[PDB]
Amino acid sequence: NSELDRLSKDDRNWVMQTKDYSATHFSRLTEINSHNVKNLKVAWTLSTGTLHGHEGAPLVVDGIMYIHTPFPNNVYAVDLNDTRKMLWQYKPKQNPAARAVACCDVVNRGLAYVPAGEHGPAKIFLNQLDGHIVALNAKTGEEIWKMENSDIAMGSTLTGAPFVVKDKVLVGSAGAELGVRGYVTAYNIKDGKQEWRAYATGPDEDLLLDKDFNKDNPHYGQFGLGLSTWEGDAWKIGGGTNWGWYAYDPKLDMIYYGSGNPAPWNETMRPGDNKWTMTIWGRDADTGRAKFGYQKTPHDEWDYAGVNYMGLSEQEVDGKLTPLLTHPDRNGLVYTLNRETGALVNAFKIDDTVNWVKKVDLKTGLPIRDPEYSTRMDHNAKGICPSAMGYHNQGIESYDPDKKLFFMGVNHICMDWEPFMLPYRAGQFFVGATLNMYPGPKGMLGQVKAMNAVTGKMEWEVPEKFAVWGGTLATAGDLVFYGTLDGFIKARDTRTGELKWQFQLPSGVIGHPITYQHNGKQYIAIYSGVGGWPGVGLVFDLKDPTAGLGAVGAFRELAHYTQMGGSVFVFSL
């Protein structure tokens, strides 16, 4: 959408969760900088009125801040000239049974926005846990249209944010832990009409492939693989849901996202490559037809769900300036591909302790597996890094184009794993593995790292007591801001990693910071409200270390530092 793209370039706005179609999470604002951030104070605050994990962050457009919650996914609008009043509210009525098919808390990654419109007025889009895509009038909160994307009776929910591209809004999927076969859908923003729907497994017509699919890298695989890499009809329940983030290159008119893990977690029940789960896609915007598809994790054994963010940049590769995507996967590799051809440029370990894979051979594109860290029936596999929580999860990260560095919140979590046999019944969980998690070999649960994604050169690395889950915001002030699960917002100098500021929020953070200018002043805003997968033990009062899909044991200390919460904090000088 060219007008949304133009609004994203204005520092008064934060128009999409990823900030802009490149997912830079980088602000050119410098009022707040490495030399004065120690004086940052709380300016004002809001309560969201819910508990549970608060993922994503607010949007700001045309002087209005938009806030969203976890289930029941309430939405509200605040005029930034009158911060105490809610301009409008939208309060969905959803079946409470939606909560029972959410594996890892009732999180929602947030709103999208489109400006007015041949279509006509400016709209806010909300994905509800219960599977509905909702278009609201951005100024009044009036419900314009609402469509059913996903059915909770099949264990199929929504948790990823909508994504606006031209006259379409894209809606993902969720429920791979319940055998949901993944699909992404484009709806027309005017009337909610479904334009196209691309599945992650099964016959080629369902996958929605370009005639020239993977022409540039035929060794990735081309046609028939969404059937031929499964045994029989196991693809029908085969996972590949897309609940993370997208990027878009308007010049190529291509959308990029990752499909999630295959189902069940028990690898022995689904022999084959399981394509096209775990895949980095480049799809044409109008038609949804994939121009490339790279499978990062063939035949997944570890739930390295391939949904993490895609950060676009333009960098030199062997002296030639190249359009790229960079993608820190759950599997502990950082992928950089040519975002026009899909060619692999690099795939390096985000931390050297990753052990499921020895290395990725860049010519074949294949990860060379270490059978010592495989999983399989009738074996308890021990010491695999990463755990299923990943060395990177759902946090949107940030890119400083002047330094050519990505800044990432990283997890340091390892696991034991043993599968078990179980039947598929629609609407029931379909996991089939028992996990125990714990800190990786360096001994802590989190890190923040700065890296060059072409060379793999780490500029700096620092430990964090817990996994850094919510992603990052970087600025021309030479700062990277992030929240921690234990309930801080922090700012570090981007040249060195040095900690310059910290503030104690009410609750842990699982979303990202934003920044924007309003009436000539810079603000930083963030949600506080712990939950999601690391917070499942404290949110649901669980005590068995293997509960919460193995997260409970690893995160058992978190409840010593934070309670649930639900608030927005806004800071300024």
């Binding site: 419900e143 314009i144 249209w145 609402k146 469509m147 059913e148 994307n149 059915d151 009776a153 099949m154 199929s156 055998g179 949901v180 076969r181 699909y183 009337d191 909610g192 009409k193 479904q194 035929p218 060794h219 990735y220 695989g221 081309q222 693989l225 031929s228 890499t229 045994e231 029989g232 009809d233 196991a234 029908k236 329940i237 022995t268 029940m269 689904r270 022999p271 084959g272 490559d273 394509k275 499978q295 063939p298 035949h299 051979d361 074949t364 294949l366 990860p367 060379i368 597996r369 270490d370 059978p371 495989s374 399989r376 029936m377 046999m421 039947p423 598929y424 019944r425 629609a426």
Partner: protein
């Protein structure tokens, strides 16, 4: 199974030592009920048909109505 021996481009799966090429008829046979397998696709067809009703009604009247019984 190191992931590098490929039967065809994009198809490199091998059984681990001692495990079967095919699961059907093995001790690891998932024995899925074809009827359970088909439920989510049937549910999708039904949502798609309801949504098309809502779209058609909007094109006909110029007013959005969610509840398909009220059309």
């Amino acid at each position: 199974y190191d992931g590098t021996h490929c039967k065809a481009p994009g198809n490199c799966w091998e059984p681990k030592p001692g495990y079967p090429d095919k699961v059907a008829g093995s001790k690891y046979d998932p024995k899925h009920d074809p009827n359970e397998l088909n439920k989510q696709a049937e549910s999708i067809k039904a949502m798609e048909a309801r949504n098309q009703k809502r779209v058609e009604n909007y094109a006909k009247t110029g007013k959005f109505v969610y509840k398909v019984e009220d059309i």
